[PDB]
Amino acid sequence: QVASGRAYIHASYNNTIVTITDPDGNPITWSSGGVIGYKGSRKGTPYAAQLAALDAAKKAMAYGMQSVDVIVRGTGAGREQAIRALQASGLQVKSIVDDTPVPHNGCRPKKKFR
Amino acid sequence: AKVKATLGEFDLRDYRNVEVLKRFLSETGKILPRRRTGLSAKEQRILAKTIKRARILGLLPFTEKLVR
Amino acid sequence: ARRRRAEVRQLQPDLVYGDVLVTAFINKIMRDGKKNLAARIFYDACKIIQEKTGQEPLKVFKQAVENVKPRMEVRSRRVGGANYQVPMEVSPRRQQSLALRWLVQAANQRPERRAAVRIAHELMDAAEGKGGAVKKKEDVERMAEANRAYAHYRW
RNA sequence: UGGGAGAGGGUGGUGGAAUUCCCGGAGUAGCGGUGAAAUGCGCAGAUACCGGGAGGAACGCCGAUGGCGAAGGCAGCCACCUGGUCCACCCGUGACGCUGAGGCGCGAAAGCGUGGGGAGCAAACCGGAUUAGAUACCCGGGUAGUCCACGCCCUAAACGAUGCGCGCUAGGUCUCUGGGUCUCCUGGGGGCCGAAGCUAACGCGUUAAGCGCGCCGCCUGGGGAGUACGGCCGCAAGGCU
Ligand SMILES: [Mg+2]
Ligand SMILES: [Mg+2]
Ligand SMILES: [Mg+2]
Ligand SMILES: [Mg+2]
Ligand SMILES: [Mg+2]
Ligand SMILES: [Mg+2]
Ligand SMILES: [Mg+2]
Ligand SMILES: [Mg+2]
Ligand SMILES: [Mg+2]
Ligand SMILES: [Mg+2]
Ligand SMILES: [Mg+2]
Ligand SMILES: [Mg+2]
Ligand SMILES: [Mg+2]
Ligand SMILES: [Mg+2]
Ligand SMILES: [Mg+2]
Ligand SMILES: [Mg+2]
Ligand SMILES: [Mg+2]
Ligand SMILES: [Mg+2]
Ligand SMILES: [Mg+2]
Ligand SMILES: [Mg+2]
Ligand SMILES: [Mg+2]
Ligand SMILES: [Mg+2]
Ligand SMILES: [Mg+2]
Ligand SMILES: [Mg+2]
Ligand SMILES: [Mg+2]
Ligand SMILES: [Mg+2]
Ligand SMILES: [Mg+2]
Ligand SMILES: [Mg+2]
Ligand SMILES: [Mg+2]
Ligand SMILES: [Mg+2]
Ligand SMILES: [Mg+2]
Ligand SMILES: [Mg+2]
Ligand SMILES: [Mg+2]
Ligand SMILES: [Mg+2]
Ligand SMILES: [Mg+2]
Ligand SMILES: [Mg+2]
Ligand SMILES: [Mg+2]
Ligand SMILES: [Mg+2]
Ligand SMILES: [Mg+2]
Ligand SMILES: [Mg+2]
Ligand SMILES: [Mg+2]
């Protein structure tokens, strides 16, 4: 059982993941689109993150969680609405930070990013 | 809110002037252009290289997390 | 249409209870423009409903419609290679239009033999909360909420 | 003589972010992907998280209508070696100059040989989909190759589809870097609109496509064809004529 923790939102074109970690970073519970019962582009939807982010939080606090610092990575249309319900969930949302990764012109991407 | 006015004399080559140099890096650690720094051409260029060198010495960051 | 916002036909309130709402319902009743006929089966049903329910059936059907008023329906939006049942806050004019279209629709569904019989019987149930009349609404409002993932596609 | 700016070129060191895999901790029912789906990956524990390690490649913001280069082309930081170039002072030589068939050297990508290297990506290839069909467009894998060293290969929308040098012909606004006296004036580049003038028109116009002088290359209907023959070059594919 833990009261304060973390929350990472992997926001992608095709989906959105919500995994909650202990203060050290060890995951304690997680959730994303399909977990609530969606398959396909419907996953790439904010309302998914809601249930996703929500269903992850709900399960989280069941272990004693009450506070978590927020971490968001990616450029997903389901991103912000996920940040929403988390706040409007039942957790103190102690902070928000965007650690979205970005190279400095490193590896080449696939054909469809050029 | 251009910055060059915010300061007076100061060495574009004092590649150790963190407290000053770190003033031109947006709160996301990025270098800030010229519509935002008030620096000119030759000026502007002489900066970064100064910043960069420090950003290699361990003084300035290559990037920073963002807080809302 | 393409020009501006169409107008709302205000009807001539009924000649019995002094209401335009009543005036609206008989229309749906009224087939082949047989207002006298339609006007009957209504105030006739208004009789049976009275006998089996001794409260002013004016209120009865004043109630059994709100119970029929759907708050959210779905509407198909085909953005890109797919059509999305984008749900929308149903409109007032339409809600009356929606409630005014299944009672009769569900009344005409009903198996009892006489017109004023059925029409009345659908009146009561909705005043309680029973019957396919409430079914459509019920089914409608939740498929939407069953599609709450498309409200950002709203209009 | 004195300076200035710059991704000019070469060697050696080097700095951080991200992708991929390996190892460790925690954790659960799906991740990924698309217009929608599927192949594919996942209870043999994936996806998203934290921590450590290995390896390769390209250098985010600065950065831009910018800069340098004869061209192709050049972009993290550092130092060394080196080229071209501009400004001023107007110090020296006193026409020493321009052009340049031949010759020589350079020459993006792909490709070739030898020996390394191999993370990401990715021709052929396999697979899954769309299709009447789909040897394709979209998706999942994936070999050469893209990277380094030394050799070749010498082509292209190698474009400004505009050869090089000089002299003459209104200006206006923007930008790079110099010099001044610092309002502004003057040199050299980079764009824009436009004087006259040219031009078949679209357009160019002190970076000419304007009026001129010199020299080189080049065109002479379309296709056949940049093919055949011969000759040269080359390991070959193929190049030149
Ligand atoms: Mg998806
Ligand atoms: Mg591999
Ligand atoms: Mg593991
Ligand atoms: Mg890791
Ligand atoms: Mg850029
Ligand atoms: Mg340019
Ligand atoms: Mg003299
Ligand atoms: Mg003399
Ligand atoms: Mg010459
Ligand atoms: Mg070559
Ligand atoms: Mg090459
Ligand atoms: Mg070979
Ligand atoms: Mg061989
Ligand atoms: Mg090899
Ligand atoms: Mg491989
Ligand atoms: Mg592929
Ligand atoms: Mg076939
Ligand atoms: Mg097939
Ligand atoms: Mg195929
Ligand atoms: Mg691949
Ligand atoms: Mg080979
Ligand atoms: Mg081969
Ligand atoms: Mg090769
Ligand atoms: Mg090779
Ligand atoms: Mg040649
Ligand atoms: Mg060009
Ligand atoms: Mg040129
Ligand atoms: Mg040509
Ligand atoms: Mg000429
Ligand atoms: Mg000056
Ligand atoms: Mg000029
Ligand atoms: Mg013009
Ligand atoms: Mg004219
Ligand atoms: Mg002429
Ligand atoms: Mg010029
Ligand atoms: Mg020539
Ligand atoms: Mg002929
Ligand atoms: Mg001919
Ligand atoms: Mg050819
Ligand atoms: Mg031959
Ligand atoms: Mg040939």
From Swiss-Prot, chain A:
The keyword Ribonucleoprotein applies. Residues 107-114 have a biased composition (Basic residues). It comes from Thermus thermophilus (strain ATCC 27634 / DSM 579 / HB8). It comes from the Bacteria. GO terms for biological process: translation. Gene3D superfamilies: Ribosomal protein S11 (3.30.420.80). GO terms for cellular component: ribonucleoprotein complex; ribosome. InterPro entries: Ribosomal_uS11, Ribosomal_uS11_bac-type, Ribosomal_uS11_CS, Ribosomal_uS11_sf. One of its GO terms (molecular function) is rRNA binding. Part of the 30S ribosomal subunit. Interacts with proteins S7 and S18. Binds to the C-terminus of IF-3; however exactly how IF-3 interacts with the 30S subunit is unclear. May contact the C-terminus of Era. The keyword Ribonucleoprotein applies. Belongs to the universal ribosomal protein uS11 family. Keywords: Ribonucleoprotein, Ribosomal protein, RNA-binding, rRNA-binding. Residues 97-114 are annotated as: Disordered. This is Small ribosomal subunit protein uS11. Located on the upper part of the platform of the 30S subunit, where it bridges several disparate RNA helices of the 16S rRNA. Forms part of the Shine-Dalgarno cleft in the 70S ribosome, where it interacts both with the Shine-Dalgarno helix and mRNA.
Curated annotation (Swiss-Prot), chain B:
GO terms for molecular function: small ribosomal subunit rRNA binding; structural constituent of ribosome. It comes from the Bacteria. The keyword Glycosyltransferase does not apply. The keyword Ribonucleoprotein applies. Keywords: Ribonucleoprotein, Ribosomal protein, RNA-binding, rRNA-binding. One of its GO terms (biological process) is translation. GO terms for cellular component: ribonucleoprotein complex; ribosome. Belongs to the bacterial ribosomal protein bS18 family. Part of the 30S ribosomal subunit. Forms a tight heterodimer with protein bS6, also interacts with protein uS11. Binds to the C-terminus of IF3 and to the central section of Era. Located on the back of the platform of the 30S subunit where it stabilizes the close packing of several RNA helices of the 16S rRNA. Forms part of the Shine-Dalgarno cleft in the 70S ribosome, where it probably interacts with the Shine-Dalgarno helix. This is Small ribosomal subunit protein bS18. The lineage of its organism: Bacteria, Thermotogati, Deinococcota, Deinococci, Thermales. The gene is rpsR. The chain holds residues 20 to 87 of 88 of the full protein.
Curated annotation (Swiss-Prot), chain C:
GO terms for biological process: translation. One of the primary rRNA binding proteins, it binds directly to 3'-end of the 16S rRNA where it nucleates assembly of the head domain of the 30S subunit. Is located at the subunit interface close to the decoding center. Binds mRNA and the E site tRNA blocking its exit path in the ribosome. This blockage implies that this section of the ribosome must be able to move to release the deacetylated tRNA. This is Small ribosomal subunit protein uS7. GO terms for molecular function: rRNA binding; structural constituent of ribosome; tRNA binding. InterPro entries: Ribosomal_uS7, Ribosomal_uS7_bac/org-type, Ribosomal_uS7_CS, Ribosomal_uS7_dom, Ribosomal_uS7_dom_sf. One of its GO terms (cellular component) is small ribosomal subunit. Belongs to the universal ribosomal protein uS7 family. Keywords: Ribonucleoprotein, Ribosomal protein, RNA-binding, rRNA-binding, tRNA-binding. The gene is rpsG. Part of the 30S ribosomal subunit. Contacts proteins S9 and S11. Binds to the C-terminus of IF3 and to the C-terminus of Era. It comes from the Bacteria.
